[PDB]
Ligand binder design. Structure first.
Ligand code: HEM
Ligand code: HEM
Ligand SMILES: [Ca+2]
Ligand SMILES: [Ca+2]
Ligand SMILES: [Ca+2]
Ligand SMILES: [Ca+2]
Ligand SMILES: [Ca+2]
Ligand SMILES: [Ca+2]
Ligand SMILES: [Ca+2]
Ligand SMILES: [Ca+2]
Lengths: 674, 671, 355
């Protein structure tokens, strides 16, 4: 895909960047115990390069990971959009997608609680088209000018740069309680959507209303929704906290691994499509990025299949350097007057100057289009092209009038939707149609299951208990109470404040489909899910049991790790490095029962801790072989428990256990407020 | 101070642009109330442009770190050994700024990664800024600066997928170590508790390289810098470090910030070993070799002065992120040596600052400015903040009367290269044969650790090497380890199911050296700032009473007390939900809370797990006011286990426990 | 001077933009281009760019950050910094505000207003307002530049446009390039004039201070240097900048003939003690005369002081009774007449006109 730019160093002698063969292991010195020489060009060119390896991280979404793939249209969508990548059944377009968190720096953990980025580039035959989305369909704020306010408040306090990758601090909660537009996205972030199981188990949203524009000039309003084919799944928070420590790279490794095993993730790329006349017909403003269109009002239309199936070759050159923009738009798509979208258009083009250090960032291989470029952009640092046209101005006769202007009527130019208009005073005023900050947060909350509502209450209890200011906590309870009195009361109980009296203005009992993780049912596939088989080297029969289970589980696409005290043939990990966060399900072979009853080879109680953690976090757990009471009793796990398995038969064990992996989380293990 | 003049107050006032025009910044300017945003909105663009350009490249190494301000005070007039002005009078005070860091992780990675640590100290002297850019480990992995990108590429994440973050626990790193045997000494230090210090305040600082002290008479001696912590030496255990990395990525930077805010600013004795030039090869190794220590048995420490950190930064980005250290920041009375690692360092820091700063005037940033007048003919460059009056910035000149004048050994207190230094021989890219012993000193270090300490180091190698996928690399690793110690090779091999190679006794010996063991360095000299978690309950008014009584006592003794319970209230600091044993140096359960050892308010078994984790990790643990200890399977008779009804008595015992800090008898040993 | 970074975006309360599409786009360009020149976002912190009033805002970090901000809650809305900085607008804090009567209506368009379509009437208004010699200089500048255009098609196209402003301009310009002017197209032709755009017609300069007088003398005659010293004194009293030129330097002589040129002066005076100069290893052949001849050809006041003028004026082919040509024995009289010439500045009757 980027093959033309690959450089192979599997053979050959070391050279400088100008092809002179050199060495790079010893400095040139005046005598064998002497000082290093300035004329040592080998030294300086190597170390200069090292000294300049780093570039600024992204201003937001610094922590992320990407892959290559393909998009395939399901139809000729001419009748709603002129977009060339959507113009024929089965038409394929290369893509590159980067997934990310938002607040943390480079090196922060994948499993922080946060909003997540989902940025997709389509390398179309009419130009690169980017959809720079999130895993949450609504954004915290209603105007792009407020972005630095939100991001400063969420990022570490600027005197000490604490805390990393967290909203659990005063400034964040100050900003949320002072700027009530934040409530919708806040509720999404405090749900399981803030701690997704993987990039593959979350959806992608464009967030803004866009337009689809036909070649005839007519337009429709659309929301983009990439629907995961892997299912929806979350971590529980305690698990996420441990994962952040045991494996900061969890989501990137999950994605890398899925692709390497031939399980590249897929999404249906969908739109909700509505008429221009419906911009205010649903009880909120389609220009308002804090609002979703309930699916009950506008169903999803499936446009095509996005599949990621190839890992990068060099992370820096591909993933770090990819530079997305919502201004990478193509004929057949247009913007709307969403004031958050509007300002974003400016930001990305500007910020790439920061990261790239020069204006020719579109020439990096990962940013290049797959079609010819014809324009009069010239010079600038890092200019890689040698332009032949020595008359780069329009209008010209000296280059025969080329490049020619492209527009609606010639050359398949981009054109602004011609029905679009503006009217009125030039104003720095918010539309009153944006004013309801609370009803949709409530719709969202109402649409969660009881244990899901508990998880969200508990996320808020955790974070808000860490806010030092009493005045901020009181202000937070005031806003939450406008969404739900019950939420305010329950959160309040953890922070020892009283919740304010019910304010019923925005309370209601309405629900909407497709926003619950817990209610979205068992996963449609268990391929890639991780099973840890806890064994022992003390009994050759425990090793045999583990091996027979491996074969049965691997047949069904599960990734199996056998854990023992020490490595040997067929054992993947030691107890010392194993952790329940490395598994979606844990199985102890009954031959290993004695380790669940001290060693220099792992921390005291390690094997039992893995089992107990896995149980506590809702995972399917079991003992294979017929003798289960010793393990289950030591773990305080009831034999009759849902998602707890005990069978002698390896075949029977696996059939049951696999039903449990698809259920994914056993929610009856979590206490609920009365 | 350069910094006071540049402080900006925003506690009052109307919002302005950067050019002082009063503006607003909350709503974009639009063509109608539901209209598109206008290009003429300068308020929006200046604000968003600044935001879009907030970030600067992280440091090529040591990207994760934290800094503080303080003071250095000389104990004496050190004229007799060095011309250095900051050392020339008893009591002479010099402002400092220090940044501490890990090495491999990017700027958002966890403090409690296993790693070498940076300890970089700037002395803003009355004769120029002087930087000692040091580490918490006295020896480095490699013998020539030109190898730095090889080491660092091998330790940093694999470049196809940028996995794993802030860890040597992967194939490439151990491939490099096993192929480049010079790495063994630092590797042993990193695999010891020195890789996971309890805080920046509980680690020492080392210049690593041999430097020179140069007198005004031109004579020189060879020196090693050693900053000796007054807080004592202390480490985490590895499992605690891993949990910490998830529960509190900011642990060391928070520890330092809080210590300073509480009037407990950390101190170090700034020391040197000092030996004659004639002793460069007298100790069985070459003092130009940065992989070797001078054992204290051969050269004792001279205490030069006190380093105290006692003021936090005002703006982390402007001060901590922007500080730009250089070993090239040297002053009269100090010189370099021909250590090939130090020699190449000199080039790197100057150049890399161009990358971070984006232009050449990085010494003009307030944190990088000196505290004396600057007189030179450096001009222009992006971001030029001075307006130079001298319009003849060339030497020699008559049109500016000869100024600035040249400074040298005999004029203007100039820097001067030590005059006894010479060079002789072919111009070579050859390694001195005197650098060839890569294994004796790693063995010396290992010999010098206590039995449990040797166990921990073995277990660290077992943990990391078990994560190496390549059978060939694992075998190569055992080959090198075996050259240091056959027993280490055997014990590590056992975890990975490989056989160790036969004993190779070339470099084996039984020698030991003082001052390198953490476990053996005795109880801590102070317990101020150490953290006590008191686990209580809102159930029982008596539980809260007990907790508050303990609090009064413990806070007077300088300890940071956290009372934990199901929910927040008067006198309760933290909920069970947010509490973790990694948050505490000691754990006390008050008698009234015995019931807690299911709720919607915290995860199942959280109270007990905190007590159990704290015991497993070696902390002093106790019950103030049988059942709790039974539930936790903690022996009542155990070392560092306290069980008392008397509060006074409990406090007195528990505080001895905090000094002991770790009860190492709780850890299994190979036999 | 190199680092000053101007922006039309640097506006203050009491001023606003208009929808001039040239202005509108400029607002983007200056802010963006300063990133290029400065290499980072903190260019407003360079001394030359700083304001002379306090700055209160939540802009942070960036390469080259020179401030140490005390406010650790740089977001709005906040309570943790008591709501500061406060928003400024029309009603509070003397904020900038967009003129409130401004509106927009209509389609979102990449279309030119037809009101912009007359590209020729005002060029004609400007041309009509120049004096005859001034019109000639403009024709001559076009003749110079267009004669260097290689493409015959481009030259034809240029005549087509010039002819829409003025048939006569097109005819005169065509004459120099060997092409024919197209037939007159009178759509935008008119005879109107406007005040204050002509240079030649703007009258004598209001001040001659700073204007440069070159006095050409010789070291061959003590008399010539005495004349130049006297002339210097009289001229300097009036704030003119005097350069005395001779073959070599000595006290009272500023410049050798070798480095002197008529372009260095607004008026040129030869002292008659120096008439003999009007070959040497000390300057190029004919240099002293060429300085005088050039100054005369370029319209400058020129003269001979001392009473003996015919030798110099005749060698220079300069008529003794020409306008802006002076000859007097009296230094006072010479200077009084000469200073009138300096205010006149250029004697335009020395330039040929198309007939
Ligand atoms: C609907 C709300 C928004 C969504 C879904 C969104 C999405 C994203 C995503 C997914 C990335 C990372 C792209 C990548 O992987 O490289 C990103 C980066 C960025 N965003 Fe946005 N964003 C939104 C609002 C904004 C606003 C309002 C601004 C500023 C006005 C903004 C400025 C940026 C900047 C400066 C970056 C770094 C881009 C780069 O360095 O290439 N974002 N955002
Ligand atoms: C004795 C071995 C060494 C020690 C003790 C050492 C110590 C340090 C420390 C403490 C920092 C962080 C300073 C800060 O807090 O900002 C640092 C940064 C750096 N080091 Fe060294 N280092 C050593 C070897 C080298 C070598 C051999 C090179 C290259 C040839 C090198 C190149 C760098 C660079 C490029 C940075 C980033 C500096 C900046 O951005 O300001 N280091 N090192
Ligand atoms: Ca905060
Ligand atoms: Ca969930
Ligand atoms: Ca740059
Ligand atoms: Ca258009
Ligand atoms: Ca690797
Ligand atoms: Ca230790
Ligand atoms: Ca001197
Ligand atoms: Ca306004």
């Amino acid at each position: 895909p980027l093959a033309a730019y690959e450089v192979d160093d599997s053979t050959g002698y070391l050279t400088s960047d100008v092809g002179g063969p050199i060495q790079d292991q010893t400095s040139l010195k005046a005598g064998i115990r002497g000082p290093t020489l300035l004329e040592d060009f080998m030294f300086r060119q190597k170390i200069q390069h090292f000294d300049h390896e780093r570039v600024p991280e992204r201003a937001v979404n610094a922590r992320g990971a990407g892959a290559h793939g393909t998009f395939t249209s399901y139809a000729d969508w001419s009748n709603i959009t002129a977009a060339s990548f959507l113009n024929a059944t089965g038409k394929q377009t290369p893509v590159f997608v980067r997934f990310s968190t938002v607040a943390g720096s480079r090196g922060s953990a994948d499993t922080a609680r946060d909003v997540h980025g989902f940025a997709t580039r389509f390398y179309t035959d009419e130009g690169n088209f980017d959809i720079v989305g999130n895993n949450i369909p609504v954004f915290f704020i209603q105007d792009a000018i407020q972005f630095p306010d939100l991001i400063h408040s969420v990022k570490p306090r600027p005197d000490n740069e604490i805390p990393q990758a967290a909203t659990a601090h005063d400034s964040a909660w100050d900003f949320f309680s002072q700027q009530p537009s934040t409530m919708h996205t806040l509720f999404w972030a405090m749900s399981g959507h803030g701690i997704p199981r993987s990039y593959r188990h979350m959806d992608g949203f464009g967030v803004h209303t866009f337009r689809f524009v036909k070649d005839d000039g007519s337009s429709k309003l659309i929301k983009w929704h990439f629907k995961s084919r892997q299912g929806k799944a979350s971590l529980v928070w305690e698990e996420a906290q441990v994962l952040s420590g045991k494996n900061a790279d969890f989501h990137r490794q999950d994605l890398w691994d899925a692709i390497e095993s031939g399980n590249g993730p897929e999404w249906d790329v969908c739109v909700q499509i509505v008429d221009e006349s419906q911009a205010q017909a649903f009880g909120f403003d389609l220009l308002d990025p804090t609002k979703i269109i309930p699916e009950e009002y506008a169903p999803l239309t499936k446009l095509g299949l996005l599949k990621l199936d190839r890992n990068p070759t060099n992370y820096f050159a591909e993933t770090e350097q990819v530079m997305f923009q919502p201004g990478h738009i193509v004929r057949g798509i247009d913007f709307t007057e969403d004031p958050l979208l509007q300002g974003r258009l400016f930001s990305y083009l500007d910020t790439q100057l920061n990261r790239n250090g020069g204006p020719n960032f579109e020439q990096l291989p990962i940013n290049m289009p797959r079609v010819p470029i014809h324009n009069n952009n010239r010079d600038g640092a890092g200019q890689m092209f040698i332009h032949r046209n020595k008359y780069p101005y329009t209008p010209n006769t000296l280059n025969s009038g080329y490049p020619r202007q492209a527009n609606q009527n010639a050359g398949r130019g981009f054109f602004t939707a011609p029905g679009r208009t503006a009217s009125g005073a030039l104003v720095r005023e918010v539309s009153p149609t944006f004013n309801d900050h609370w009803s949709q947060p409530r719709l969202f909350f109402n649409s969660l299951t009881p244990v899901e509502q508990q998880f969200l209450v508990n996320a808020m209890r955790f974070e808000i208990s860490l806010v030092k200011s009493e005045e901020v906590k009181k202000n937070v309870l005031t806003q939450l109470n406008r969404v739900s009195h019950d939420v305010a009361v329950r959160v309040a109980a953890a922070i020892g404040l009283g919740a304010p009296d019910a304010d019923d203005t925005y309370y209601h009992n309405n629900k909407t489909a497709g926003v619950s993780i817990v209610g979205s049912g068992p996963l449609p596939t268990i391929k890639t899910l991780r099973v840890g088989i806890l064994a022992t080297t003390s009994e050759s029969s425990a090793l045999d049991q583990a091996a027979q289970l491996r074969t049965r589980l691997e047949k069904d696409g599960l990734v199996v790790t056998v854990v023992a005290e020490t490595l040997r043939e067929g054992v993947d990990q030691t107890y010392s490095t194993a952790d329940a966060t490395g598994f979606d399900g844990v199985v102890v072979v009954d031959g290993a029962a004695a380790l669940f009853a001290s060693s220099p080879l792992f921390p005291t109680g390690r094997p039992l801790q893995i089992f107990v953690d896995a149980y506590r976090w809702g995972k399917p757990v079991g003992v294979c072989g017929g003798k289960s009471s010793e393990v289950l009793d030591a773990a305080d796990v009831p034999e009759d428990g849902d998602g707890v398995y005990s069978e002698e038969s390896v075949d029977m064990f696996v059939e049951e256990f696999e039903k449990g992996l698809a259920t994914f989380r056993f929610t009856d293990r979590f206490a609920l407020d009365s």
